[PDB]
Amino acid sequence: MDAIKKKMQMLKLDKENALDRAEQAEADKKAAEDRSKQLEDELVSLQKKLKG
Amino acid sequence: MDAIKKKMQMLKLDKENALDRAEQAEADKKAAEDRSKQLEDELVSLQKKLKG
Amino acid sequence: DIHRKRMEKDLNELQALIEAHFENRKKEEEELVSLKDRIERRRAERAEQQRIRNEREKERQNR
């Protein structure tokens, strides 16, 4: 009984960790996408420059 | 009893789904990161080729 | 489509599971009440048995 009582806190922590990890992964994905978009815009600008 | 068994199993399933969403986000993030590295490499290559 | 289904099912199944546990808990509560009632009536039955034993001892002494 005591085993399940104290280990339930551990289960709660595992759920919270999975939620936070998913949140952080989505945030880092958004940051990576933003930086990729800006790099793409700079690459097209420099390609136009090179063509000229 | 039996309800506890099935409820815990459904929870197990929810946790796997949460890890699945995290893994999907991380895979998309890895794809975006690979695109960013390729774009940065092309960008530096373009900048020095333009200078030349 | 799949994810929405998964959430819908998880929510409604969780509600059904909670209702099922409450039904088991109330049945256990009724069994607990009956258990206490049986404890008191077993006490009364033991009192009746000791009184019957006393009556039998008197009968044995009378003959």
Angle at B29 between CA B27 and CA B33, to 5 degrees: 120
Q: First-to-last CA distance in chain A?
A: 76
Give resolution, Å, one decimal: 4.8
Cα C3 from Cα C9, distance rounded (Å): 10
Question: Cβ atoms within 10 A of the Cβ of A40, count?
Answer: 15
The C-alpha angle with vertex A48 and arms to A44 and A49, in degrees rounded to 5, equals 115
| PDB experimental method | cryo-EM
User: CA geometry: angle at A44 spanning A41 and A47, to 5°?
Assistant: 150
Closest residue by Cα to residue B40 from A30, A48, A31, A43:
A43
Q: Which of A34, A41, A29 minimizes the C-alpha distance to B30?
A: A29
Question: Using CA atoms, how far apart are residues C55 and C51, in angstroms rounded to an integer?
Answer: 6
- Residues 6 or more apart whose Cβ sits within 8 Å of residue A46: B43, B46, B47, B50
Gap between the Cα atoms of C1 and B45, Å rounded: 44
What end-to-end distance do the CA atoms of chain C give, in Å?
91
Listed by number, the residues of chain B in 1-20 with a beta carbon closer than 8 Å to a beta carbon of chain A are 15, 18-19
Spatial separation of the C-alpha atoms in residues C51 and C63, rounded to whole Å: 19
> In a mutagenesis test of the B interface, which of C7, C8, C9, C10 is the best target, namely the one with the most B β-carbons within 10 Å?
C10
Residue A35 has its nearest CB partner, among B21, B28, B36, at B36
